[PDB]
Amino acid sequence: VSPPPPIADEPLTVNTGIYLIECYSLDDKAETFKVNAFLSLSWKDRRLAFDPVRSGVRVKTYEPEAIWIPEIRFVNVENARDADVVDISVSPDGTVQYLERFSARVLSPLDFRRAPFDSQTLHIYLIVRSVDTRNIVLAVDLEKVGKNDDVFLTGWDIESFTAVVKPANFALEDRLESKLDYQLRISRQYFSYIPNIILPMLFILFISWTAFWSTSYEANVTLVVSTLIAHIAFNILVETNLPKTPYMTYTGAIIFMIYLFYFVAVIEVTVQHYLKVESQPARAASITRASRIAFPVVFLLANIILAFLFF
Amino acid sequence: VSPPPPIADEPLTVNTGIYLIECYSLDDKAETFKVNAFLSLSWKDRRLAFDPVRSGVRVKTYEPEAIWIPEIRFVNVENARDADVVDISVSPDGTVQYLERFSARVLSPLDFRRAPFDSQTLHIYLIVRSVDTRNIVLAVDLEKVGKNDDVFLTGWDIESFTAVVKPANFALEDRLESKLDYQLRISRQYFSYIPNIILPMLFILFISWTAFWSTSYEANVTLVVSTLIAHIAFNILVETNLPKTPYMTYTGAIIFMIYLFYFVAVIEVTVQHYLKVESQPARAASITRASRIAFPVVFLLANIILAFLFF
Amino acid sequence: VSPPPPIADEPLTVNTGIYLIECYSLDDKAETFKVNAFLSLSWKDRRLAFDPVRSGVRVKTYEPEAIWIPEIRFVNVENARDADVVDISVSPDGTVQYLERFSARVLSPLDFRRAPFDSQTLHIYLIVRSVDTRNIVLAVDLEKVGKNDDVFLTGWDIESFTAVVKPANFALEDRLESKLDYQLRISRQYFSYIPNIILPMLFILFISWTAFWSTSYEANVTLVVSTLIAHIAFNILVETNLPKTPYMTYTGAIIFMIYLFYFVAVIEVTVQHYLKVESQPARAASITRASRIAFPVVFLLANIILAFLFF
Amino acid sequence: VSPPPPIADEPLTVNTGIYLIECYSLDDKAETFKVNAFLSLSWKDRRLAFDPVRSGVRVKTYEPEAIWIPEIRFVNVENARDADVVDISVSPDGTVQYLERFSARVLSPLDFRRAPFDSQTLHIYLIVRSVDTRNIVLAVDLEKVGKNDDVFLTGWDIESFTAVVKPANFALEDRLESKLDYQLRISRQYFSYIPNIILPMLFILFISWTAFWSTSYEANVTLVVSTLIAHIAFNILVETNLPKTPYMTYTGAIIFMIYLFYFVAVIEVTVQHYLKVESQPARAASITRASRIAFPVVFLLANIILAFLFF
Amino acid sequence: VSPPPPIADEPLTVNTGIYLIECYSLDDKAETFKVNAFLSLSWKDRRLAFDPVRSGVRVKTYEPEAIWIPEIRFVNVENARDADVVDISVSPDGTVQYLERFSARVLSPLDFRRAPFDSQTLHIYLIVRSVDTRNIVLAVDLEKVGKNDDVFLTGWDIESFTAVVKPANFALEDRLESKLDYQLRISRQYFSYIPNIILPMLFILFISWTAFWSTSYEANVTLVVSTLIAHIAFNILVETNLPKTPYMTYTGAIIFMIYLFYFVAVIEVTVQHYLKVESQPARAASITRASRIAFPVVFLLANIILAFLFF
Ligand SMILES: CCCCCCCCCCCCO[C@@H]1O[C@H](CO)[C@@H](O[C@H]2O[C@H](CO)[C@@H](O)[C@H](O)[C@H]2O)[C@H](O)[C@H]1O
Ligand SMILES: CCCCCCCCCCCCO[C@@H]1O[C@H](CO)[C@@H](O[C@H]2O[C@H](CO)[C@@H](O)[C@H](O)[C@H]2O)[C@H](O)[C@H]1O
Ligand SMILES: CCCCCCCCCCCCO[C@@H]1O[C@H](CO)[C@@H](O[C@H]2O[C@H](CO)[C@@H](O)[C@H](O)[C@H]2O)[C@H](O)[C@H]1O
Ligand SMILES: CCCCCCCCCCCCO[C@@H]1O[C@H](CO)[C@@H](O[C@H]2O[C@H](CO)[C@@H](O)[C@H](O)[C@H]2O)[C@H](O)[C@H]1O
Ligand SMILES: CCCCCCCCCCCCO[C@@H]1O[C@H](CO)[C@@H](O[C@H]2O[C@H](CO)[C@@H](O)[C@H](O)[C@H]2O)[C@H](O)[C@H]1O
Ligand SMILES: [Cl-]
Ligand SMILES: [Cl-]
Ligand SMILES: [Cl-]
Ligand SMILES: [Cl-]
Ligand SMILES: [Cl-]
Ligand SMILES: [Cl-]
Ligand SMILES: [Cl-]
Ligand code: NA
Ligand code: NA
Ligand code: NA
Ligand code: NA
Ligand code: NA
Ligand code: NA
């Protein structure tokens, strides 16, 4: 079966729609998500036209094999989608209404700069390659674009699922390709990071600062080095979940900066001891008293500066 | 093959049943479970009717291809179910009895608020899309809904497997859809968490409180910081298994609260030392004596308050 | 093709056999194992009978499609077995001899009570559903039940592979089902746990008891808390491999009990210090001297009691 | 269907092209990458030639089954590629233009010597085995070799995707094989390793060197041993991601060398204490003062030497 | 299609060959490897014979369906191999030459006794079951056994790929089975274990021995216990990669033995302190001086003895 012939030299418009049924497994590190949706397609094939008076029927149902169907593929998929044709309906004028249900592992990158206080635009790109007889162009039927109310992406809030209605038409290997951009706008549920990582991480840092109210070098060394190790554990846990980005992230900046605070606290603890040994405890006392204010103040300003740069 | 024609304008009732054979792999983090069950379907197709006297046979067996079979799908599946037709039987009146055995990875969310002392309702949603000629409606044949006594979900107790008999009929992409809710009510076997996480986690906390019967700052620092680190390890272990929830959980509340106890114990240990150094050990002694009672009392009340709020 | 017709009203006996070729991937946590075996089936179909004198041939080979074959399924499988038909042979009386080679992920639970000194009975349940015309019953042909000498389950010793010859015949959804129990009796190779977990775990415990020959509180705190942390690491390692059981296990009991020994050692260390500070070292000395004997004695008796209760 | 016959004695030239659509999952440890691309093939089959007047069509579309297609395989794949034929077009002279879209897990090794400041050449080898009637030879159609501008390999920069135009023609099992080398030149985005591993790892090392400004053996032992343990954690994290190479890597050399610095710091700390105890603090003081300069200087030179050897 | 008939009562010889293209994913813990190779088969079918003068053709190419092909399976595979037929060629005498390209996950056990200084013999067992009409026997065509020079098993050196030319013929379920043993002899690239595990593990042990040049109990306790914990980390890392063997391994013996050295060092440190407290430092001094020589000497001899027993 060949494609529908043109009345004049007009391209064949394949009207499309994606209706999300299930949306799951957003793997931040892999920059992939899994989708289970309806894909609706509609085009006119005048060869399939019939008089509803003579045929009696208002619609005709065909099996995929029986008629010409455009080869629509997804651009940003890992492997070709698992699809199962739900229905093919032909109206008297030869307007075909195709509907399939698919599942695919979509590969769409994320911007980790503001994580875990980030929003993302996930993309699903539909594409059609033109044939030798006819040039095929994609369209968005907005009435057939949507999502189920139940659609739950774990740890994310779904804001919108819309399509950029004008296709990106371009030549590829001396044939026209018509690409459509479906955008799933989501935003991260940052809540759990506050009691699980952020607050634990701050408590261990504040525990290191108790060394500014201690003259015991042996105890201070323990306080600052032990807490530094706990910070390393959190840094490792975090980087095992976040992918390695060519750009600096907000979480990255904060986690790194905190190392400097541990490093400088070790210097303070060392300086204080050296002076106490050198029989200069008055000077050590001045440095320790300053540190008590300096450390939280510099920490607060540094965070204000970082938050400002990133948001 | 087209759907059965109506005797008036009645919808086609497809009677359904799910009989669980195997029920496994409840992945709390993924909010998925795997099921292996029988799916039974029954509808009347008058075109298949026969006189048992003339045909001799009381029943006729057909191959799926030979007759019209309704396209029943599962809503909340990752990928389309692996199904293998067991039997298709037609009675003289044209009543079809279909039976298949399937396996599917069902995606049903969990409420982690009371974990690990939680119960869940897992769902399996059956659905059928209406055709242009006939509107298809699902029904529950209660005699064909059940589970094997052997059905064992590891780390969970199966309470019930029932169906909400009235289908949810609604329009989707300008066609009627008939949805049925099958509910598997389960409850967590919390036992192992008591000797594995809960009691170990309490023992390390109580070990930190031995610092209230010690004047050795260096030893106290070791006690409180070491145990804090062991608590961090347990917190990490727990959050690697529990998914990140937009809501506060009972396990989350407790784990977080305990950090405050470690933080305040470090403050106490610091204050006690500072005073001992400042040649004020009487005041330090009063604070230490109070802490001995205050810490367990506040811990017990805080837990009473939390348990109350959550249960 | 319909099932073979009965001479009188007798059920159709399908003689079965399973011959293990490969037996691998026993995942204790998942309570699954993978099997690769021969499945042999044999039944009489009088319609296939021939005179070996007239036909010349002593046997006839058929393709699965050519004849009626009973639908045999496995009960406790995750997904339906990957099977590839090896041979179908018909004798002059119409006795069919079917042989296929399959692979399946069998789901059979384990009793972790005595782990790692435990034995298990793995099961493979064969089943057949009766048809409308004839009732099908399973049988065990013992000459066709066995295992390859090479069959190696890693970390386990294969004791036996036998079948419970009497099938479990029962009604399920108003049809007879005939179930056969194939049992693979195995026993754990516990050896490696002795040098890898058991002895390391005891050495760290005995290191904590060296605090009973020390008056240095600071050193004792370090000994007992450090070793407690190493025990937590081993506890975590162990529970990451063992599934969460609703019952107490031998490994669970021991690992838990050891926490009590660490907890009580911390109390001893605390009491000894308090008394030494209170200028009562004679009393502290008596308590420390007792602990030296009490701790190993109570440890040995507690283990004797536990081993007795579990074995 | 047999291969096209030769006019003369010429081999059959199959012109090839690979156009990368998606390029993902570079697993350094596994030395594999996943690709999703177009594979274009073109050859002349004079048997397929036609008159466009008689057939009406100027080009003919065939299903793969309908005609002879060369069996092109990938050499360095794990499993045979998932391919889905996009189009097969025959021109009146019998010139066939085949296009499929595939996904494959390509197995191409990496040189970890300069990691994470390394570049790689990934390979995709196309191959065709000659038949008994005709010898088949591969060619590169450069106009059909390329990549999408969007093609993003996470944590890597794509430099080029080119083909070595001359095939490697050789005998294999008494038949000619024609192999083509497609090369994807990439280079690692090393950035994230600086704040995540490199700088944390240096800070802990520099913290160990604060023991050269301390006379407290107990504190020094803590500083050097604690930081040594944090270095072990980083070493483990790194080797869990990098494969085990038979050659020394730059990351390997650095990580190993740092152990020597920790080992020697422990010796210094031990020597300093021994002398202080032996009532020789003047000698200990000289050794400690030297260490303050020696340790960073030797560290800097050692790194200069290593960087020089590796780059 | 039936098998070739015998001239006289002779078995049918199927000549075989395996030519490795790709050899990857040796999973020591799983005792599996993945292979991608050519499988060549050749037998005489006199029914396929032709006169090359009358037929014109020197060879005939058949589709698998067209002729009788022996059912060859692999014994030690997880699941049946993914195979794709490359060619089937018949010579005038009826000599068939079959060639397919396959991929399979082969399950062949390893002897971990000498790891990581171990060599292995991996096996690929080819098998054929005799049919009722003819008995089938396997043979090795040595000209068709080989490997690509590029064949690279990561972290292993490929020494040889040969076949044991005489098959293992045996009866299985009253039919002859002919088994061929293909052996891939490999040897581990132990290099990386020296800088990654072996040398780090020795450095931490030697750091524990610095306690023999210290009178500070508190510091010694820290040295020996901290390093013991780092040894536990390495032991865990190692056993997460090595499978649990019913026999003692070289790596196992060494790792275990080292615990005894840590245990005894703790005893020495304890004895030294007890004596120092008991105002007997002269005796403690003698014990400490002995330990300085005893510990390395006993370590070196113990290793000599172990290496001797294992190699
Ligand atoms: C500002 C101070 C520092 C703040 C703390 C740092 C938090 C920064 C955000 C880190 C984001 C982590 O991103 C983490 O990625 C992994 C991917 O490997 C996800 O991992 C998993 O997610 C869900 C289960 O929950 C699965 O459906 C998914 O398939 C799986 O990959 C985690 O659910 C996600 O949360
Ligand atoms: C109140 C103080 C704190 C109490 C301690 C905290 C306990 C809270 C409950 C945590 C629930 C953990 O939930 C954990 O999730 C993972 C999913 O990644 C499951 O993981 C696994 O389960 C089984 C094996 O056992 C598999 O069939 C499944 O496929 C797999 O994912 C764990 O079996 C489950 O137990
Ligand atoms: C008495 C004191 C305490 C003694 C120490 C405690 C030991 C108790 C027994 C623990 C049993 C651990 O059980 C562990 O389970 C996991 C499943 O996740 C298995 O894990 C793996 O096994 C093999 C590889 O070896 C694979 O084929 C399998 O697919 C995989 O899951 C481990 O091989 C098994 O050993
Ligand atoms: C000079 C001092 C030391 C410097 C620090 C050391 C860094 C050296 C380079 C280490 C390279 C690590 O290489 C690491 O390999 C694993 C493979 O298991 C990749 O692992 C993963 O990558 C991505 C997700 O992020 C997936 O698409 C991929 O399938 C998966 O395997 C890591 O993304 C990669 O970064
Ligand atoms: C004598 C003192 C002690 C010496 C140190 C101890 C070393 C002893 C040898 C340990 C062998 C470890 O064996 C380890 O097993 C795992 C199996 O999951 C392999 O794991 C992985 O290997 C490669 C990637 O590198 C993959 O293709 C493979 O699929 C994967 O399983 C490791 O590559 C292997 O190295
Ligand atoms: Cl697609
Ligand atoms: Cl479905
Ligand atoms: Cl099955
Ligand atoms: Cl391929
Ligand atoms: Cl096979
Ligand atoms: Cl025999
Ligand atoms: Cl035989
Ligand atoms: Na079509
Ligand atoms: Na300490
Ligand atoms: Na049908
Ligand atoms: Na059949
Ligand atoms: Na073809
Ligand atoms: Na055949």
mmCIF file of N, CA, C and O in Angstrom, chain A residues 197-227:
data_model
loop_
_atom_site.group_PDB
_atom_site.id
_atom_site.type_symbol
_atom_site.label_atom_id
_atom_site.label_comp_id
_atom_site.label_asym_id
_atom_site.label_seq_id
_atom_site.Cartn_x
_atom_site.Cartn_y
_atom_site.Cartn_z
ATOM 1 N N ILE A 197 18.626 15.209 54.315
ATOM 2 C CA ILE A 197 19.992 15.595 53.950
ATOM 3 C C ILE A 197 20.346 16.992 54.464
ATOM 4 O O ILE A 197 21.359 17.123 55.141
ATOM 5 N N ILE A 198 19.549 18.034 54.125
ATOM 6 C CA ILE A 198 19.869 19.434 54.454
ATOM 7 C C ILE A 198 20.041 19.651 55.958
ATOM 8 O O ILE A 198 21.118 20.082 56.360
ATOM 9 N N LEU A 199 19.007 19.376 56.779
ATOM 10 C CA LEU A 199 19.098 19.597 58.223
ATOM 11 C C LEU A 199 20.161 18.678 58.866
ATOM 12 O O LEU A 199 21.074 19.246 59.495
ATOM 13 N N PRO A 200 20.206 17.336 58.612
ATOM 14 C CA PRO A 200 21.329 16.533 59.144
ATOM 15 C C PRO A 200 22.710 17.140 58.826
ATOM 16 O O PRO A 200 23.534 17.310 59.747
ATOM 17 N N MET A 201 22.924 17.542 57.555
ATOM 18 C CA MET A 201 24.169 18.148 57.099
ATOM 19 C C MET A 201 24.546 19.442 57.840
ATOM 20 O O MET A 201 25.737 19.685 58.063
ATOM 21 N N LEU A 202 23.543 20.274 58.207
ATOM 22 C CA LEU A 202 23.765 21.527 58.945
ATOM 23 C C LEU A 202 24.086 21.262 60.391
ATOM 24 O O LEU A 202 24.970 21.924 60.920
ATOM 25 N N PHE A 203 23.391 20.292 61.027
ATOM 26 C CA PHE A 203 23.617 19.894 62.415
ATOM 27 C C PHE A 203 25.038 19.430 62.647
ATOM 28 O O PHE A 203 25.646 19.830 63.628
ATOM 29 N N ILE A 204 25.585 18.615 61.740
ATOM 30 C CA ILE A 204 26.959 18.129 61.863
ATOM 31 C C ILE A 204 27.944 19.306 61.722
ATOM 32 O O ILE A 204 28.899 19.381 62.501
ATOM 33 N N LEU A 205 27.650 20.277 60.836
ATOM 34 C CA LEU A 205 28.477 21.486 60.666
ATOM 35 C C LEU A 205 28.482 22.338 61.937
ATOM 36 O O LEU A 205 29.554 22.765 62.382
ATOM 37 N N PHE A 206 27.286 22.558 62.537
ATOM 38 C CA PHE A 206 27.124 23.339 63.765
ATOM 39 C C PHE A 206 27.796 22.660 64.944
ATOM 40 O O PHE A 206 28.345 23.358 65.791
ATOM 41 N N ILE A 207 27.839 21.309 64.956
ATOM 42 C CA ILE A 207 28.535 20.515 65.976
ATOM 43 C C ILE A 207 30.059 20.778 65.873
ATOM 44 O O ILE A 207 30.738 20.846 66.902
ATOM 45 N N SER A 208 30.583 20.966 64.638
ATOM 46 C CA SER A 208 32.006 21.249 64.453
ATOM 47 C C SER A 208 32.365 22.601 65.092
ATOM 48 O O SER A 208 33.428 22.723 65.696
ATOM 49 N N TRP A 209 31.428 23.571 65.049
ATOM 50 C CA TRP A 209 31.592 24.922 65.593
ATOM 51 C C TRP A 209 31.595 24.987 67.134
ATOM 52 O O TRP A 209 31.942 26.034 67.698
ATOM 53 N N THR A 210 31.276 23.865 67.816
ATOM 54 C CA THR A 210 31.312 23.804 69.280
ATOM 55 C C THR A 210 32.783 23.777 69.754
ATOM 56 O O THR A 210 33.057 24.023 70.926
ATOM 57 N N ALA A 211 33.728 23.538 68.822
ATOM 58 C CA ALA A 211 35.166 23.527 69.058
ATOM 59 C C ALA A 211 35.646 24.963 69.386
ATOM 60 O O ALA A 211 36.747 25.138 69.932
ATOM 61 N N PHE A 212 34.802 25.983 69.095
ATOM 62 C CA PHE A 212 35.123 27.382 69.391
ATOM 63 C C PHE A 212 34.801 27.743 70.854
ATOM 64 O O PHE A 212 35.087 28.855 71.284
ATOM 65 N N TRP A 213 34.215 26.795 71.610
ATOM 66 C CA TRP A 213 33.916 26.933 73.032
ATOM 67 C C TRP A 213 34.675 25.858 73.840
ATOM 68 O O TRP A 213 34.276 25.523 74.963
ATOM 69 N N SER A 214 35.779 25.324 73.242
ATOM 70 C CA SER A 214 36.653 24.298 73.817
ATOM 71 C C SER A 214 38.125 24.612 73.609
ATOM 72 O O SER A 214 38.532 25.015 72.514
ATOM 73 N N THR A 215 38.917 24.385 74.672
ATOM 74 C CA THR A 215 40.374 24.568 74.754
ATOM 75 C C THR A 215 41.102 23.216 74.605
ATOM 76 O O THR A 215 42.338 23.191 74.478
ATOM 77 N N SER A 216 40.318 22.101 74.579
ATOM 78 C CA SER A 216 40.816 20.741 74.451
ATOM 79 C C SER A 216 41.091 20.395 72.990
ATOM 80 O O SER A 216 40.154 20.026 72.269
ATOM 81 N N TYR A 217 42.370 20.500 72.551
ATOM 82 C CA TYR A 217 42.805 20.202 71.173
ATOM 83 C C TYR A 217 42.350 18.810 70.710
ATOM 84 O O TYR A 217 41.775 18.661 69.627
ATOM 85 N N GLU A 218 42.574 17.804 71.566
ATOM 86 C CA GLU A 218 42.251 16.404 71.324
ATOM 87 C C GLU A 218 40.743 16.246 71.042
ATOM 88 O O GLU A 218 40.350 15.533 70.099
ATOM 89 N N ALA A 219 39.903 16.974 71.812
ATOM 90 C CA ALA A 219 38.448 16.942 71.638
ATOM 91 C C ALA A 219 38.024 17.673 70.357
ATOM 92 O O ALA A 219 37.163 17.188 69.622
ATOM 93 N N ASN A 220 38.636 18.846 70.096
ATOM 94 C CA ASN A 220 38.362 19.657 68.921
ATOM 95 C C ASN A 220 38.679 18.875 67.657
ATOM 96 O O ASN A 220 37.821 18.790 66.781
ATOM 97 N N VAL A 221 39.890 18.260 67.584
ATOM 98 C CA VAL A 221 40.353 17.440 66.462
ATOM 99 C C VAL A 221 39.274 16.401 66.159
ATOM 100 O O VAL A 221 38.864 16.271 65.002
ATOM 101 N N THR A 222 38.754 15.737 67.224
ATOM 102 C CA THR A 222 37.693 14.725 67.136
ATOM 103 C C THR A 222 36.416 15.332 66.565
ATOM 104 O O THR A 222 35.914 14.816 65.570
ATOM 105 N N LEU A 223 35.932 16.455 67.149
ATOM 106 C CA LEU A 223 34.724 17.146 66.697
ATOM 107 C C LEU A 223 34.761 17.483 65.223
ATOM 108 O O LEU A 223 33.863 17.076 64.486
ATOM 109 N N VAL A 224 35.810 18.201 64.790
ATOM 110 C CA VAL A 224 35.931 18.695 63.419
ATOM 111 C C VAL A 224 36.203 17.575 62.394
ATOM 112 O O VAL A 224 35.604 17.592 61.312
ATOM 113 N N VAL A 225 37.057 16.606 62.731
ATOM 114 C CA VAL A 225 37.387 15.535 61.793
ATOM 115 C C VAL A 225 36.216 14.543 61.660
ATOM 116 O O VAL A 225 35.883 14.153 60.542
ATOM 117 N N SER A 226 35.551 14.199 62.771
ATOM 118 C CA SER A 226 34.415 13.262 62.759
ATOM 119 C C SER A 226 33.271 13.794 61.917
ATOM 120 O O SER A 226 32.770 13.091 61.020
ATOM 121 N N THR A 227 32.881 15.060 62.188
ATOM 122 C CA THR A 227 31.819 15.717 61.451
ATOM 123 C C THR A 227 32.218 15.870 59.978
ATOM 124 O O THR A 227 31.355 15.659 59.120
#
